[PDB]
Design an enzyme around this catalytic site. Structure first.
Site, short mmCIF file in Angstrom:
data_model
loop_
_atom_site.label_atom_id
_atom_site.label_comp_id
_atom_site.label_asym_id
_atom_site.label_seq_id
_atom_site.Cartn_x
_atom_site.Cartn_y
_atom_site.Cartn_z
N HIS C 1 0.82 -1.16 0.48
CA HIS C 1 -0.04 0.01 -0.07
C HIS C 1 0.99 1.40 0.08
O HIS C 1 0.61 2.75 -0.84
CB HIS C 1 -1.14 0.59 1.37
CG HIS C 1 -2.11 1.14 1.21
ND1 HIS C 1 -3.47 0.28 0.68
CD2 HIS C 1 -2.28 2.02 0.87
CE1 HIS C 1 -4.62 1.25 0.52
NE2 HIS C 1 -3.45 2.89 1.28
N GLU C 2 1.57 0.98 1.07
CA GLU C 2 2.79 2.31 1.29
C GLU C 2 3.74 2.70 0.26
O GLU C 2 4.31 4.05 -0.91
CB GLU C 2 3.11 2.28 2.08
CG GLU C 2 2.43 3.13 3.12
CD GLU C 2 2.15 4.95 2.65
OE1 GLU C 2 3.02 5.71 1.93
OE2 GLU C 2 0.93 4.99 2.84
N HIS C 5 1.74 3.94 -2.74
CA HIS C 5 1.58 5.91 -2.00
C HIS C 5 2.93 6.66 -2.26
O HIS C 5 2.79 7.55 -3.66
CB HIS C 5 1.23 5.78 -0.92
CG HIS C 5 0.15 6.61 -0.61
ND1 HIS C 5 -1.20 5.12 -0.28
CD2 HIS C 5 -1.16 6.86 -1.04
CE1 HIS C 5 -2.16 5.42 -0.52
NE2 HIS C 5 -2.21 6.28 -0.24
#
Lengths: 36, 53, 48, 50, 52, 317, 48, 317
Positions: C1-2, C5
């Site tokens: 997820h990061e 991002h």
């Protein structure tokens, strides 16, 4: 552009919109030639 | 008292001094100001206009 | 997820400065990334 | 669409008129504003006495 | 709210007339915004001078 | 809650006009008629999910059943052009058909808005008026000539030329419905736009010869069908709105008017509940010299057409 | 880690619209306002 | 501001469909195409004062000019049935015409909403899918079979039978568009009305044989003209509404679905910006026993028709 260079949410655009809405409300509430 | 003295006396009253001076960097707000001031001058000739900057 | 991002944050020509990203900050089951907006956008006073 | 015509075609004529009057007034004001011949003191006002 | 579509068309005709008027005087706004670009302030005297 | 009876609803014009009338929100009963091939049109229309009812009748014997309690009678019947046919035979056939149909309308129901569509309408409306006069039941307030296709074409050409808002464009058209009779009042086009002399002449000749353009564009396949059906449906809806008490029904039509010395003329009229209510005379006031000379040019031939119509309509049997 | 991998770069969304200050030329317009009036209402229903 | 190109707009169904598309407030450009007599329809349409523009193209050589930047492709082309001609030759002619048209669309505009009206659509949509597959550009989300006529007939028959409001009544129809392959889901009709057994049987047979009723009422004059034009205009306007981002455009169509073992099926679907967005499977959940045996009886013939279609679509040249 896909509306890419618009200047949303700054000083006098909101004031102009508010003044236009107020003038329209005044004109439409006082109707009860000029207008078709 | 010339008209420029009156203009400069009015400008010192309706303007605030500011350090870290910056200007507009994306023109188009200038176009908005130009069009609004033109429409104000030609149509409503009984109201003043503060100087555009 | 990061990672997604970070990848999409660093895939643009002019984005906010990525200070640091940290996985599992202080035992919490999450993550945090820090982005600092550029000085010109703060000095503008408006958004596009 | 359901909205037919709005305010007028004559009000547009009036706003064109006032636009042209202000433009012509500015045009006249720009070029004939400054002309001065003299400002001499009128201190022989004879119509009061002579 | 049956009175939300009359004002929209009124402003639409206002915008159309303003666009049709500004098209003919495009040079005016051009020289005017350039004058605002070079000289950082713009009063009514420069305004009326640039109306030429 | 009104009934429209279309006489000749199985021709070229009959099917699109019936389709447009069926799914209009004003009609509730639609009595189609033709001498043949009307059952298929009724079967086609009965499957649509519109509340208006369609019934069909075959042969003149059912004509007495077709016009009962009908509020609006529309007569678009008439054979299109065949190769080798002159104006005499086609005029005789169309005029005999419209004579029989107007006789049937006068016998069965004379209190209906009669819309004459068959061509030429300059020489057909006087025939219908004379036939209605012979039964002593003629009502000049309830007899119209559908000439709104000229108005539609004028609006189309003006909008294409001047690049104007088409929802606002309307052009008055006076005179007749055949050729040089069409006088588009282009100086009274709303909203206000100014034309040049060459533009005025080009628009006038285009409006006057659009009928010939659309006939010869088909290469002998017939006259205008979709635009004529458009105009007919527009006039039908306007007349049905006039029957409902609407107080701003202004339409351009060819009716028995006293604006000129002619008995029949095409002008703007205001239609009411009982038929014709007012005739707008200001369409003839303020004309320019071009429109004035075009009017005096078309007046003599319009008089000739009306005289030909009333001359045929009084021929002995 | 973005340097030697050659990703697929995006276009610039926050590029400013600016005017040449002293370049004497007539910048163009399209020819209209891009605003559209909001007017959406259905046709009156049947059997009326 | 959307563009529709009609391939075969000079036939029986084409002219009223083109006229109704001209009246639509969503179309801005209408491209009529036919091998002959297509300029007359364009000349008829151009006189109407509607903002949409009509252009015509004649011959296959202009077909490449017909389909440039076209957003919706409509294919009603196909010669109606002639006396003395069996299913084989008419099937070959219609399938060859639709094959050439789908080849032209695939070469010119693969990304257009393809609406097939040519009959039978049960053996035509697989042919179009196979032709689009051979170019490696087939999109199953943008290929539809217009079967709105059965829905309209079902709504009309239910409103005539149980006497409801024709505005509110909607009947889902699944299966196919030919013969006993049409299954009206009369138990899920909104608003809710409960039928009897013989009423269900009568409504089912009337819906299934409305086609033969309307082609035998004309006495060999051809097939229905106005009703499929109505249904095609409704489907085109619904597709154009879904193309604008409207999030409640649900329509009944014959598309490549996975609800049953059949590759193609007619069901209710939700159309979005990128074509087909959702397929409603709850139309197959909760069926009664009669609809279940009707579905299992119609599945064999639907599979046979699809098999015949894909068998023709892969024949050697």
């Amino acid at each position: 552009p896909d509306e890419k260079n618009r200047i949303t949410s700054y000083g006098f655009v909101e004031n102009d919109s508010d003044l236009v809405h107020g003038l329209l409300e005044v004109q439409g509430a006082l109707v009860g030639t000029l207008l078709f | 008292i010339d008209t420029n003295t009156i203009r400069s006396a009015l400008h010192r009253q309706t303007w605030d001094l500011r350090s870290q001076v910056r200007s507009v960097q994306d023109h188009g707000i200038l176009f908005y100001q130009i069009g609004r001031a033109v429409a104000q001058n030609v149509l409503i000739s009984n109201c003043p206009i503060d100087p555009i900057s | 997820h990061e990672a997604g991002h970070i990848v999409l944050a660093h895939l643009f020509p002019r984005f906010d400065w990525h200070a640091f990203s940290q996985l599992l900050p202080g035992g919490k089951e999450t993550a945090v990334s820090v982005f600092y907006p550029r000085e010109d956008m703060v000095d503008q006073g408006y958004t596009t | 669409p359901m909205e037919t015509q709005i305010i007028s075609d004559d009000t547009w004529k009036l706003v064109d008129e006032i636009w042209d009057k202000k433009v012509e007034e500015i045009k006249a004001e720009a070029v004939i504003q400054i002309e001065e011949e003299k400002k001499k003191p009128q201190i022989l006002m004879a119509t009061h006495f002579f | 709210l049956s009175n939300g579509f009359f004002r929209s068309n009124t402003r639409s005709e206002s915008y159309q007339y303003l666009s049709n008027l500004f098209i003919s005087n495009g040079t005016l706004l051009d020289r005017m915004t350039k004058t605002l670009l070079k000289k950082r302030w713009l009063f009514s005297d420069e305004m009326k001078i640039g109306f030429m | 809650s009104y009934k429209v009876a279309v006489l000749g609803a199985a021709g070229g014009i009959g099917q699109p006009l019936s389709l447009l009338i069926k799914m209009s929100p004003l009609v509730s009963t639609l009595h189609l008629y033709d001498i043949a091939n009307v059952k298929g049109v009724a079967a086609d229309l009965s499957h649509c999910n519109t509340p208006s009812q369609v019934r069909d009748f075959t042969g003149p014997s059912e004509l007495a059943d077709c016009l009962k309690d009908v509020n609006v009678v529309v007569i678009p019947a008439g054979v299109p052009r065949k190769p080798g046919m002159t104006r005499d035979d086609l005029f005789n056939i169309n005029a005999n058909i419209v004579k029989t149909l107007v006789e049937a309308v006068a016998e069965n129901c004379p209190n209906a808005f009669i819309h004459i569509i068959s061509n030429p309408v300059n020489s057909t409306v006087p025939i219908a008026a004379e036939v209605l006069k012979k039964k002593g039941v003629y009502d000049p307030k309830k007899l119209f000539g559908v000439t709104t296709l000229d108005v539609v074409r004028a609006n189309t050409f003006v909008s294409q030329k001047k690049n104007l808002k088409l929802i606002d464009v309307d052009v008055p058209v006076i005179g007749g419905h055949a050729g040089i009779t069409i006088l588009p009042l282009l100086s009274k086009t709303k909203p206000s736009v100014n034309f040049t002399d060459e533009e005025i002449q080009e628009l006038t000749v285009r409006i006057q010869n659009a009928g010939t353009e659309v006939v010869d564009a088909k290469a002998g396949a017939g006259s205008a069908t979709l635009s004529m059906a458009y105009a007919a449906a527009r006039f039908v809806e306007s007349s049905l709105r006039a029957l409902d008490g609407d107080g701003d029904v202004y339409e351009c039509s060819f009716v028995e008017s006293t604006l000129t010395d002619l008995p029949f003329f095409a002008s703007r009229v205001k239609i009411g509940k009982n038929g014709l209510e007012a005739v707008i005379e200001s369409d003839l006031q303020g004309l320019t010299e071009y429109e004035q000379k075009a009017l005096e040019a078309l007046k003599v031939e319009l008089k000739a057409s009306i005289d030909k119509g009333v001359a045929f309509a009084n021929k002995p049997a | 880690k973005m340097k030697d991998l050659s990703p697929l770069m995006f276009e610039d969304f926050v590029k400013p619209f600016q005017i040449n200050p002293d370049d004497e030329e007539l910048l163009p317009h399209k020819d209209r306002v891009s605003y559209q009036p909001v007017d959406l209402r259905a046709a009156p229903l049947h059997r009326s």
